[PDB]
Each structure stands twice: as structure tokens, then as C-alpha cells.
Amino acid sequence: GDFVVGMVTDSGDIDDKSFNQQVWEGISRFAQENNAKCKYVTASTDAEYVPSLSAFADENMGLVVACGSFLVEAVIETSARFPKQKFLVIDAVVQDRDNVVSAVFGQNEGSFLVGVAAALKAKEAGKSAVGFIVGMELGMMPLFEAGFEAGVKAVDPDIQVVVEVANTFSDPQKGQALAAKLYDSGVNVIFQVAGGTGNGVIKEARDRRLNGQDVWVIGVDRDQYMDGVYDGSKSVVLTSMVKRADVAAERISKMAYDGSFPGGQSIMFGLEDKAVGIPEENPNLSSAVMEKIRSFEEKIVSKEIVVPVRSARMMN
Ligand SMILES: Nc1nc2c(ncn2[C@@H]2O[C@H](CO)[C@@H](O)[C@H]2O)c(=O)[nH]1
């Protein structure tokens, strides 16, 4: 009765206020705007990856959407078994499948911009270290730290980045504990790239500011500014590294619907396409800081500056 987009997620959370929420929102906008339909299924564990993708393929859906490094092996295999079913993979890369489109993000480029913001706010307080909490380091995840570090160093090479890995995108309790550890060490800015776990980092930041500690957090995926309001007016969210996974999902769903699915291609959503970067409006960033950020942004887009894909501590 309808063209249907089916999302298989490795997370039991489309309300994660970040990544899975953006993807579902994009699929949902596509369906609403095109008189189509959509649904999703959660595949918490590995053993459910193959059967989950297979069931949607057996329903002859218009498009099957899968995200992350946990689902890619299952997509690689399943796409070969169902050559006539279209699949979209987000945050991972598939080769040799003309029925699969891979959407990847230049998140190192966007993270460079928030690194500049972090370094400037840290210097403002005489701090020589900033924090970074990442959900997991598999797949393309290392791009965030690589760009964040590069942006921090572009402002001041002596500022150190202190990294904590949660090893989960669905544990806010862990997010708060890791944020507490960083703030307790004297850091005043933390960039969180941790999906649902990240909501706990934002909570810890709100709790600290509420009681007079001058701390900040930089959000991810969505413009998380309102998520950090702690006293009725002010927010602890310095800025956010926005990643338009919603636009990628919406646009490719439309191409599938229209017969122009770019099967077999990897599509890069970057700073020049405005698919990553910072929000258009940033109450906590001054005009001076914004001009500095915009300046670096232009040098990255033109390639005058190329942002690394791996941080210094991860390079030989
Ligand atoms: N595989 C996977 N990646 C996620 C999830 N949540 C967040 N991420 C990744 O972590 C980044 C920051 O939230 C997102 O842009 C994604 O790259 C999740 O539930 N599963």
C-alpha cells in the first residue's frame, strides 16, 4: 500500500536526543512529505543483525536503513543475498554492492570548529586542558577526536586534550561519571560525542554550573543548546558539533523513492555541504569567536587546511 522505509538500529533509543533521533527524524520527514511510511526495529545484540535486515528485505521495503560499525558486516552479507533490495548504511562504508549507498560524515572537519571554540573558552579561564568523552572508538568514530584535537591545537598547541571512552552509547550514568572525573580534574570544557550516554555528560555539566562551577559542554549531532539550560535562562552548552544524519536519511530515502538511488556510491556529507559544523545561532559564542571559527571553516572547505583523520596519539 505504500513505499516503506525500515530502519534497523543497534540502539533501543530513537529518543536519544542525538544520533538515532536525527536519523529517525529524517526518515520520518521523508515519509510525511511524500505520503509514505516508515518503521523501525531494534537489534540490541549481534545475533539479531542478520535476521532483522533479512525480515525487512523479505517485506520488499522501498529502503532498508542501517547505521554504524556493528551492523555493517550484516549489511554487507545481506545486501548480497537480496540484490534487488536497496540499503542505506550511515556511519560505515560498504564496497562492491550496487544496491547499497554509504553515507559518511566529515565529522573531523566539523569537530575542528568546536575544538577552536573549546580552546578559546579554556584560554579565557586560563585552562591548559580540555576534555573529550567519546562513546566508542570503532569505525569512523576516531574522526571526532582527530578534528577536535586539530582545532584545539590551531588555537594553542600547549592545550592538552584529555580523553575518556565510555564504550557505550546508551549509558547516561557512565556519561555522568566520566564527566565528573574530567570536571573534578580541573577541566572546564568537555566535548561529548557519545549519543545517549552523552545526555549524562550534559546533566553533570548542568548540575555543576547550577552550583557555581564555571564549566561547559559541547554537544553533538543535534543543536543541543536547550538541553543544557540549568537556571531558567542560561545554558551550559557552549556550542554543538551538528551532524545532519537526518538530511542524509531524508535525501537518500527520496532518491530511492524517485528511482535515482545512487547504489554503489559512498556519499560524503561535509562542512562544505553544511552537513556538519556548528549551529547557525550560538548564544554562548561571542562575535569574535564566531569570526575565528568562520575563518577556519573557509580554509577547510577550500582545502587550504586539511583536517587529519586520526589524532596525534593514534598516529605512528
Ligand atoms: N553505532 C552507533 N553509533 C552511535 C550511536 N549513537 C551515537 N553514535 C555515534 O556517536 C556519534 C555521537 O553521538 C554519532 O554521530 C554516531 O557517529 C548508536 O546508538 N550506535
Binding residues for guanosine: 10, 20, 91, 169, 195, 221, 243
Comparing CA positions, the residue from 248, 245, 252 lying closest to residue 86 is: 252
Judgement on whether residues 61 and 191 belong to the same structural domain of the protein: no
Q: Which residues pair with 219 in a beta bridge?
A: 240
* DSSP strands (E only) in the chain: 4-9, 37-42, 63-67, 87-90, 100-105, 129-134, 160-165, 189-193, 216-221, 237-243, 266-269, 276-277
Judgement on whether residues 116 and 262 belong to the same structural domain of the protein: no
315 Cα: distance to centroid of ligand 1 (angstroms): 23
Tally of structural domains, the chain = 2
For residue 130, what are the CA distances in angstroms to 88, 125, 215, 230, 293? 36, 11, 11, 21, 18
Runs of H (alpha helix) within 65-211: 72-81, 107-124, 142-155, 172-184, 198-210
The SS3 call for residue 155 is helix
Judgement on whether residues 143 and 155 belong to the same structural domain of the protein: yes
Judgement on whether residues 280 and 224 belong to the same structural domain of the protein: yes
Judgement on whether residues 111 and 126 belong to the same structural domain of the protein: yes
* CA distance linking residue 81 with residue 154, whole number of Å: 47
* CA distance linking residue 27 with residue 207, whole number of Å: 34
1 Cα: distance to centroid of ligand 1 (angstroms): 33
Q: Do 102 and 92 form a contact (C-beta atoms < 8 A)?
A: yes
198 CA: nearest ligand 1 atom: 13
Comparing CA positions, the residue from 70, 69, 75, 66 lying closest to residue 46 is: 70
Mutate to test the pocket of ligand 1, among 169, 223, 227, 243 (most ligand atoms within 8 A of CB): 169
Task: State the cell numbers at 221.
Answer: 549531532
- Is 49 near ligand 1, meaning CB less than 6 Å away? no
Q: Do 284 and 237 form a contact (C-beta atoms < 8 A)?
A: yes
Judgement on whether residues 126 and 70 belong to the same structural domain of the protein: no
Judgement on whether residues 163 and 299 belong to the same structural domain of the protein: yes
Binding residues for adenosine: 10-11, 19, 91, 169, 195, 221, 243
* CA distance linking residue 249 with residue 67, whole number of Å: 10
Judgement on whether residues 210 and 278 belong to the same structural domain of the protein: yes
169 Cα: distance to centroid of ligand 1 (angstroms): 6
Comparing CA positions, the residue from 133, 110, 112, 132 lying closest to residue 243 is: 110
Q: Do 282 and 116 form a contact (C-beta atoms < 8 A)?
A: no
Judgement on whether residues 151 and 230 belong to the same structural domain of the protein: yes
140 CA: nearest ligand 1 atom: 17
- Residue with CA nearest ligand 1 atom 16: 19
Judgement on whether residues 168 and 280 belong to the same structural domain of the protein: yes
Which residues form the domain of 56?
1-105+244-269
243 CA: nearest ligand 1 atom: 15
Rounded to the nearest 5°, which phi and psi values hold at 188?
-115, -5
Task: State the cell numbers at 132.
Answer: 573529550
Provide the CATH number for the domain around residue 118. Answer: 3.40.50.2300
Task: State the cell numbers at 196.
Answer: 545517549
Judgement on whether residues 49 and 194 belong to the same structural domain of the protein: no
For residue 171, what are the CA distances in angstroms to 61, 62, 175, 183? 32, 33, 6, 19
For residue 164, what are the CA distances in angstroms to 175, 183, 192, 315? 10, 12, 10, 18
For residue 228, what are the CA distances in angstroms to 163, 168, 206, 259, 270? 21, 21, 6, 42, 26
- Is 240 near ligand 1, meaning CB less than 6 Å away? no
* CA distance linking residue 184 with residue 35, whole number of Å: 51
* CA distance linking residue 230 with residue 84, whole number of Å: 50
Task: State the cell numbers at 152.
Answer: 584545539
- Residue with CA nearest ligand 1 atom 9: 195
Q: Which residues pair with 5 in a beta bridge?
A: 38, 63
Give the dihedral sign, CA 69/150/185/190. negative
Judgement on whether residues 163 and 312 belong to the same structural domain of the protein: yes
